[PDB]
């Protein structure tokens, strides 16, 4: 039963670190297509 | 008395009178344009670390 409440803290644990690195990938997405964008329109 | 009238020869072979509309704006404003692209990428790189800070911090 207490492997139960281990699974319930290492899903809490992983959770917040998927909300964290979701963060991260999002600015990386947005920084990359602001690079794009503006290396696309000085020619 | 010499330096001073070849000069002032020289001076009056290459007059004009009209004002040179040769200018250097638009290179100036391209690399301007260019550091402020490094300088947005410098901020935004500083907020991915620190989220990564965040995240490895726990």
């Known amino acids: 039963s207490e492997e139960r409440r281990e699974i319930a803290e290492v899903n ?3 959770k917040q670190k ?3 690195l979701k963060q991260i990938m ?3 997405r947005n920084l990359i297509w602001d690079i794009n964008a503006m290396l696309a329109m000085r020619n | 008395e010499a330096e001073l009238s070849a000069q002032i020869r020289y001076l009056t072979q ?3 009178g009209q004002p040179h509309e040769g ?3 638009s290179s100036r404003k391209d690399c301007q344009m260019a550091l402020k692209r ?3 990428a410098r901020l935004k790189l500083s907020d991915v670390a620190r989220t990564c800070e965040q ?3 726990n």
Do not use: P
Request: hydrophobic letters at 35%; zero cysteines; glycine letters at 0%.
């Open chain 1, 12 to 14: 809490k644990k992983l």
């Open chain 1, 18 to 20: 998927n909300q964290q």
């Open chain 1, 26 to 28: 999002d600015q990386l």
């Open chain 2, 14 to 16: 290459v007059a004009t």
């Open chain 2, 23 to 25: 200018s250097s704006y």
């Open chain 2, 38 to 40: 490094v300088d947005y």
């Open chain 2, 55 to 57: 995240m490895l911090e």
